[PDB]
Enzyme design. Sequence first.
Site, PDB file in Angstrom:
ATOM      1  N   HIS A 748     -57.063  25.464  24.226  1.00 52.25           N
ATOM      2  CA  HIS A 748     -57.261  26.864  23.459  1.00 52.25           C
ATOM      3  C   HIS A 748     -58.747  26.843  22.889  1.00 52.25           C
ATOM      4  CE1 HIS A 748     -52.925  27.542  24.622  1.00 52.25           C
ATOM      5  NE2 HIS A 748     -52.935  26.084  24.120  1.00 52.25           N
ATOM      6  N   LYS A 757     -43.837  29.774  20.066  1.00 60.06           N
ATOM      7  CA  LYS A 757     -43.007  29.448  20.896  1.00 60.06           C
ATOM      8  C   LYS A 757     -41.586  29.708  20.453  1.00 60.06           C
ATOM      9  CE  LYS A 757     -43.906  26.274  24.457  1.00 60.06           C
ATOM     10  NZ  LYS A 757     -43.044  25.287  25.613  1.00 60.06           N
ATOM     11  N   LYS A 773     -55.755  20.046  24.785  1.00 56.38           N
ATOM     12  CA  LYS A 773     -54.175  19.375  24.966  1.00 56.38           C
ATOM     13  C   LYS A 773     -54.616  18.003  25.357  1.00 56.38           C
ATOM     14  CE  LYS A 773     -50.057  20.109  27.632  1.00 56.38           C
ATOM     15  NZ  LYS A 773     -49.310  20.869  28.605  1.00 56.38           N
ATOM     16  N   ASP A 822     -18.295  15.005  16.357  1.00 60.74           N
ATOM     17  CA  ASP A 822     -17.606  15.149  17.922  1.00 60.74           C
ATOM     18  C   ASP A 822     -18.459  16.046  18.431  1.00 60.74           C
ATOM     19  OD1 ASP A 822     -15.962  14.414  19.861  1.00 60.74           O
ATOM     20  OD2 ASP A 822     -14.254  14.535  19.144  1.00 60.74           O
ATOM     21  N   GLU A 916     -16.435   8.942  17.572  1.00 62.00           N
ATOM     22  CA  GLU A 916     -15.507   8.709  18.537  1.00 62.00           C
ATOM     23  C   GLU A 916     -15.558   7.316  19.079  1.00 62.00           C
ATOM     24  OE1 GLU A 916     -15.549  11.615  21.498  1.00 62.00           O
ATOM     25  OE2 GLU A 916     -17.369  10.849  22.373  1.00 62.00           O
ATOM     26  N   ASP A1166     -14.453  24.478  18.451  1.00 59.51           N
ATOM     27  CA  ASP A1166     -15.406  23.275  18.297  1.00 59.51           C
ATOM     28  C   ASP A1166     -15.257  22.595  16.837  1.00 59.51           C
ATOM     29  OD1 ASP A1166     -16.417  23.750  20.916  1.00 59.51           O
ATOM     30  OD2 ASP A1166     -17.812  25.332  19.990  1.00 59.51           O
TER      31      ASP A1166
END
Length: 1209
Positions: A748, A757, A773, A822, A916, A1166
Amino acid sequence: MLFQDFTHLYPLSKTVRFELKPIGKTLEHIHAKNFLNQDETMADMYQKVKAILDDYHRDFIADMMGEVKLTKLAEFYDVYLKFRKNPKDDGLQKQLKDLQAVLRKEIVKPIGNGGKYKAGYDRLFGAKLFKDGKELGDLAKFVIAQEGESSPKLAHLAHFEKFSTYFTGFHDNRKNMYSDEDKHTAIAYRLIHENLPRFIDNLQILATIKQKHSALYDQIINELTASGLDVSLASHLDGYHKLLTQEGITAYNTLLGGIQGINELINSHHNQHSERIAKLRPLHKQISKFADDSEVCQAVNEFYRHYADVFAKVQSLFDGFDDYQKDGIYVEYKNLNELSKQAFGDFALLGRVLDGYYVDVVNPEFNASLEQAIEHYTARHDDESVQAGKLGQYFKHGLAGVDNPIQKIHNNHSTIKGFLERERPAGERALPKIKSDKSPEIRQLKELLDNALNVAHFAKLLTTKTTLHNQDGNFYGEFGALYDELAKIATLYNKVRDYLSQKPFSTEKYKLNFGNPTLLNGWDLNKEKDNFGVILQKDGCYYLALLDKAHKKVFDNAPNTGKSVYQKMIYKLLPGPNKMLPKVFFAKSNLDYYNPSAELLDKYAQGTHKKGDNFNLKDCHALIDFFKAGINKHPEWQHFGFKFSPTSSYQDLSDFYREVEPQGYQVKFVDINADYINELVEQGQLYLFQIYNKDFSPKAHGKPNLHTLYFKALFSEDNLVNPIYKLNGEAEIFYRKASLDMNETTIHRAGEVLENKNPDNPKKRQFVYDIIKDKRYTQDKFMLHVPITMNFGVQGMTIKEFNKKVNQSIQQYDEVNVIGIDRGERHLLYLTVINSKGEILEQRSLNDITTASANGTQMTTPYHKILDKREIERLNARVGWGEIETIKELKSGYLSHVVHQISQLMLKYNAIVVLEDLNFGFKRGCFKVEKQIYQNFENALIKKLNHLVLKDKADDEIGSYKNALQLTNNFTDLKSIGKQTGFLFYVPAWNTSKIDPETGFVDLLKPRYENIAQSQAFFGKFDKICYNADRGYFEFHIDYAKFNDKAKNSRQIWKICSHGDKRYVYDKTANQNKGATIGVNVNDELKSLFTRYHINDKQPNLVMDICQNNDKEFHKSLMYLLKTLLALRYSNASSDEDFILSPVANDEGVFFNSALADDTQPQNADANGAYHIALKGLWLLNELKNSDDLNKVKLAIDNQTWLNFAQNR
RNA sequence: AAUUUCUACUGUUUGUAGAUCUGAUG
């Protein structure tokens, strides 16, 4: 305050790794002496010397075999036949396993204690593989490797003389070949367990001389093989030790494989020309990178194409699958479910069918059990091509499941054998290297190899590692040579997985030894001239300075005065205080000025465990004051600040070695003038590196890195008093060359605008400097991997405590909170914190995780919106195969954030985290987080709470780097994770997800329509079915004593009622092909099919009036409307909406709807899966509060004990 | 889209928050 005294318990070591920036003009001096190129070509020759040593191991195997003289072959012939009673299978297979062990003892016998081959071996230990006796190869392989002083060899072996310790990790792998154990890497495994059952099997087919009609034509095989390839090596039992070597097996497989061979002779003279003889199976021979683009394009041009691997042999064999007997074709239990998913239905049909027609011979009467054990694991595998069940009671009638191995190759062979239309874009053009694209014409190459593993699975159903008598030798005789050829696709496909899904950079680094074999093996000492490396400080940073071979005498007379000076570490250290103190005990008159015959002899017989089964004072008195006065004599351990306790205060010899472990390690810092140091680095007499990671930068302003906080704690001024941390020896300095170009990666530029993003943040930043990068992989850089040790000086240990320390601290503490974590079906993870009374403190999803506190600002990142973006990234068909690992890289990285979230939850509430149990609660449905991923979370949660430090906390608080928390057991026992690791607990996750959390109601009966003959008897067990005109819903009374699946718990009576709207779970058919979630309205649909099928419902009750109707859709749809009611969790097409609605009411009379309302109750479906996990941890808390003796408390949960606890609370 | 290394990044104009082992073919 629960974790108050859990600091400084057991020692654990770690490895902290940094960069090394070359300070001064020392990079030019390193490039002058050619250190990097020397170590580069040395790590290049390492592969060739490893190949030479592998050839030496091969020659040593071939020389070692042929001297075994095993003499239990006739006894194995008697015991092994006739395949040892597979219905019985217990008490005789044990003695066969003992006979296999006493046979494989002889393979490792003729070298150990035998003395023909000299049990030390002289060459597996890599110390004297190089430079002993000025040459060792007169007996060894160098008489082969000479070739009159060969130019490729000998010179490549000249490097690894002083640097013999590069093979200390390689010899550990080769030490497992000669093992006595029955692990499958051994030599004795492949001879006695692989080849020997196949040798008795190959002989016994050929030993049927007079049993079959082979009395006549047996000789015409032996006359034609009298010219060559004699069958007498393969026709007698005593001729097995002829082929123990590799050169014997290849001569044997030349006979069986052919090219003329015996397999082609019996096929031409007896088969080709009602009854067809079987074929024999060849034995097993007994003991990569793929970096370049040229290799894997030349690999998959001939190693997998129609030259080498033949799918025409599975073509004609499976085309005539019906002709072979389906009694003799066998199917193992491991591939029942995979057979039932790929063909003939769902994942659980054959488990339903096989247990459906084997449970009729067992009657549970007494209800310890002793019948449900032996019936389960024995008869579950039918081991034939099944008759698809009789199922005359109308259990989902369908066609045959036996003609499918016929039909798979017969499924439009253009389509199902897709290699034929994938042979057109082929070719090997001249190419050194190419970079992978998102969609070039190589997507067809991975789909060529996609059908490759599918054919490997199509033949994997008949895995059948038998050793069974009446199996079809005609089918398996050709299948033995065919599947072993076909099972090498999994290794080839996993390697093209690794190459084509590559990152643009490379991570290959070679160890720099700087011409020194013992570089950095010990730190600054008297022996700092051997190890070359000193550590310097310039009041902001830490420097690693390396000596030179020319000038090793610079720091002997160094200037101590100056402004702005470099400090220098001293590091005097005593290693192994219980080990090095008897290394001064053996002296003639050096330290034994007073050597008593009493004290010396009492140290021999009574030195182990402080006495020879006694505990006395006097011999413990005379030993210490000899060692105490002995320390002061010799100049080596003198000048140490040894502040010893008197002999009267402590009598235990473990206490005396505990006092010299912290005082044995002393680090000081005397300084040295800087302009003296700086003027010699530019000459080249000493190299200066700076130990540097990203928080040593001047521009850094955030919270420091975690491992930097350990390395800064090594040289603190509070390490003058008793040290917690410790600098370990044997460090290493790696070098990673430039594996990336500047123009290759997308950068860049200056003044370019960049979009955020994340979907939350809309802002854009200008970034006046350039951003490249992978700036780390653009330019080559050094490394340094410092090993450190925490809690050095403490003597305590692991699970020997039996977790008494954790369990006692819980009982003395009052009002402990429980944490349950969980998995979720619509959430990534879910959390719920429960007090001792049983009510929720907080319940919050882990979709959004907010710990991102830079300087008081909090950034919440959505990990559910990223996984939605990753899922469409995998949806693209015309793309590469490597996007499935980007999601696994993320889930491996997401759980590293979750480990931080739980460790801050535990501190806030003084809580207990209950997870669990993966050993026997692993049977679960589909989830957003997998099972192999969730074990890495449950492992990384243990390693974090081993040494838990908080970064924002000050040094006075408990939980800083000074007082590190020790919450779980040490991770040396990484495999065994059962029911407790410190504060972590492990509960079975069965019967937690769908329970009404108000009244504790689980559906113990399962309404499933199998036969209408007993569907009458099912509804007759109901107590009273009526309709409430005033209340408005039906009333399915039940009593669990009358049904099967009997339950010991309370509430055997229930009251199933109807409601307004139950969003039905996904149930679809080919015609139903739709959005596949059709929500039902149960209470008016029960008003339907009663007025439709002419049955009045006004009469109380109407339980027997159901039983007089046999319409075949009345009893069937009453199952469909009861399976809706008894299912407790409901998931709709709207992904945000997932909930639980329960039929049974409370004592007050209101029903539980999780959507309306949320008052200290689980918010959705959930949250209920995480709420009942933490209720299982509340019962483990209630066992510890009700434990008066804590030594042998068993924390296990029976299935009826949890059901009795959840609803009587 | 910058890192001893991984993940998510943009999180003061050369960076932010967590995590991080050590040795090594399936």
